[PDB]
Design goal:
The structure is a homotrimer of 283-residue chains. Chain A has 283 residues and is of the alpha+beta class. Chain A contains 10 helices and 11 strands. Chain A has 2 domains: 82 residues, no CATH class; 187 residues, no CATH class. A 6-stranded mixed sheet of chain A has the order 2-6-7-5-4-3. A two-stranded antiparallel ribbon of chain A has the order 8-11. A two-stranded antiparallel sheet of chain A has the order 9-10. In chain A, helix 4 packs antiparallel against helix 5 and helix 5 packs antiparallel against helix 6. The first copy, chain A, starts with a strand and ends with a helix. Chains A and B meet through strand 6 of A and strand 1 of B. Strand 6 of chain B pairs antiparallel with strand 1 of chain C, so a sheet runs across the interface. Bound molecules: the ligand Cc1ccc(-c2ccc3c(ccc4sc5c(c43)NC[C@@H](C)NC5=O)n2)cn1 (3 copies) and chloride ion (3 copies). Chains A, B, C: It comes from Homo sapiens. Chains A, B, C: Its EC number is 2.7.11.1.
Chain lengths: 283, 283, 283
């Protein structure tokens, strides 16, 4: 045996042949709304994304399918070509992410401590997800707090990356947008506020007072303004703080407290990161 | 439930797996010949159009499929990708239109009266067909006497529009060609001769002697030389003569008599309308 | 009935659903390696070509499928779209050519005579293969000793043409490359060495001493430097030496002896023909 996995089985049937669709809205991505649906055999809950059919959508779906095999990428189970209001659309059925957002979960931790080791485990997971994409020459280009979601409500749920609506084949810089995004997420993970305000990005006391240079040097190599200066995903995953995530110190962070204190500005933080990512895309 | 309808199930099998094909010719459209065939389960008679496979054909078929749902558009039941003389072709199976042409049927009415109310019912049907196409941003661009056919030999048969071989997506004027065509059909419906000879388009006595300004104003807004002046299909369907077609006066027309008198020139009338439409397309 | 044959049934499933794949290598073509596999129902041996998925591959496969029906073209049985190392590839399953190369078989004849009539039968077979391709406006563009293979180890096995990795639709010179290739093969068939060295192409004594002008005139019309001077495949197949291949004289050739004597340079002969064909392609 040699370990081929199935190609894109894009289906022509009406989805209602195979899935019961609902009007429960689960989310909105940058291309459109995400709806709940139920598999007509199993009753298992799934999520449906409606994309109006187009060459851009046909490429993006194919990239998400190629991404699907990675344990930290949201899996596609089915894709349909259907007619809706007489205009042709694509319906992507994905696995149900009832676990919510990465940082919203941390902000909802309350009592218990959020450690540098847990930040290392999360950042290893995110980096491991990007590593698969870059190794097959796919760049995500919209890695951000809205797009990192958990599979279940338990503490040991597994984090998966979402919304390939900006993804791009690097075949002949686009890959550097993911590495910048990883540095921003890692910064927010370690103190609860972002490295931007609209005169440097600071490392303010007290939150950073005991934080190592080892992480801060790792941050400095990710947040370079020039894309050519940023470390690659390969170099990131080989850093000891990432590679040896079990051995990382259990250092308590301020992150949860600060995210609660700044909760009224958190929507703005996510919006200006989206604006920064859009600026790096219209490049 | 939400009312999705099935996407283009283009089939790879040999059509003879599914349909018995015959050598009975039913017609010729602008792209090619139309043949009789029989569904191998049901024995129901259908019509087969052979299009040599091409990107232009692949788009046009998709537009005809999107059009198919409208009650006044000829339905596609199946589409096949086959090999013929070693060169790849597309076979479109459509519903059987044994009812013949719109004006040929009127010309064959003989005895009984053809009324302005019946012209309003026909023009409502044609306008209702175009309205669906324009509302999904499809323009037909070849609406003409050859392309409006009836489902059955009875008087109350339903009229359907045919031959998407010039149709075009208006997505970024093409839509105005259908509105010009509707005005020409409406003119011929009301007197039996066209508004062209090769010094105005007339409204000659006696045939127009009792014909209202309400229709003639409606005609004047459709036959404008500049496309930007023509009424839209929306404005046409809202005209009282169209909207209130049951209330339209039962005025007897000269149409059938004139079509019989001018039958020797009717082929030329259809040919010069095709030439006028081709001129408006090479635009 | 009208004799449609099935279109390209390109399949989405994992090939291992349908075929047991092996690590036995059968060959390498210009695009990639050819592997042995077994049909999971029948156990019949087949050959698998892995092409990384691309528009160029999607066209070439379609051309090979259209070619497939000809008895002297290697048949495709199935085509799959699969994922491999997370990158999308195409797997072409072809009929098993255990019979080896055209000239390698002749070189391995040893004892028995190789006749001008047998050279006429081989050249009729090759010309008959090209005739199908040109009649559907496909040019092969890499007809050469590596690409002409036999279906079985018996003397009366049937010769088939292979490797459509350079084939091209002539739709608007490319067709002339096949005719040049046929002339080179015919030359080598008749004496055992090629008409090139890197000052004319000779007809040396003794091998050509009794060879007719009828073949040599046929050769002269195929090896013209200017493509516009070469005979077409139609004119070739109408030549009496080809058309009347059963009536061709049983003249004994030197070919097998010379191929054995020059066996140490035969790999170079095939390589410089490939280089000449590449030069005629980068045109
Ligand atoms: C109880 C419960 C059940 C399901 C969900 C849920 C929410 C959002 C998504 C989802 C599954 C897939 C995708 S995909 C996708 C999503 C989502 N959200 C919008 C953006 C991030 N873009 C995307 O592509 N399942 C939440 N809670
Ligand atoms: C008894 C009997 C049985 C069948 C028919 C019949 C004639 C023409 C067509 C048809 C069905 C589809 C299409 S399509 C199409 C057609 C036709 N005609 C040519 C032009 C208008 N273009 C087209 O695409 N069925 C007439 N009489
Ligand atoms: C016992 C035994 C069993 C099988 C074979 C065998 C060798 C080469 C090929 C083949 C089938 C298809 C194709 S295709 C293709 C091939 C081959 N060879 C490489 C080049 C010519 N290009 C091509 O496309 N079967 C030889 N011996
Ligand atoms: Cl997506
Ligand atoms: Cl059509
Ligand atoms: Cl090939």
């Amino acid at each position: 045996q040699f370990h081929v996995k199935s190609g894109l089985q894009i289906k022509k049937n009406a989805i209602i042949d195979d899935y019961k669709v609902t009007s429960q809205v689960l989310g909105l991505g940058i291309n459109g709304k995400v709806l709940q649906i139920f598999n007509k055999r199993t009753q298992e809950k799934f999520a449906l994304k409606m994309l109006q059919d187009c060459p851009k959508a046909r490429r993006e779906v194919e990239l998400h399918w190629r991404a699907s095999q990675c344990p930290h990428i949201v899996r596609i189970v089915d894709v349909y070509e259907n007619l809706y209001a007489g205009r042709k659309c694509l319906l992507i059925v994905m696995e149900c992410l009832d676990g919510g957002e990465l940082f919203s979960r941390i902000q909802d931790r309350g009592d218990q401590a959020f450690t540098e080791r847990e930040a290392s485990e999360i950042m290893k997971s995110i980096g491991e997800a990007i590593q698969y994409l870059h190794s097959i020459n796919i760049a995500h280009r919209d890695v951000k707090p809205e797009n990192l979601l958990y599979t279940s409500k338990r503490p040991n749920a597994i984090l998966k990356l979402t919304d390939f609506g900006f993804a791009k084949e690097t075949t002949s810089y686009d890959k550097s947008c993911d590495m910048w995004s990883l540095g921003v997420i890692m910064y927010i993970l370690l103190c609860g506020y972002p490295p931007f305000y609209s005169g440097q990005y600071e490392f303010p006391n007290p939150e950073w007072s005991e934080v190592s240079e080892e992480v801060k040097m790792l941050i400095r190599n990710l947040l370079k303004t020039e894309p050519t200066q940023r470390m690659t995903i390969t170099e990131f995953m080989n850093h000891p703080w990432i590679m040896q995530s079990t051995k990382v110190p259990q250092t308590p962070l301020h992150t949860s407290r600060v995210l609660k204190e700044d909760k009224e500005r958190w929507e703005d933080v996510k919006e200006e990161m989206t604006s920064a990512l859009a600026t790096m895309r219209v490049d």
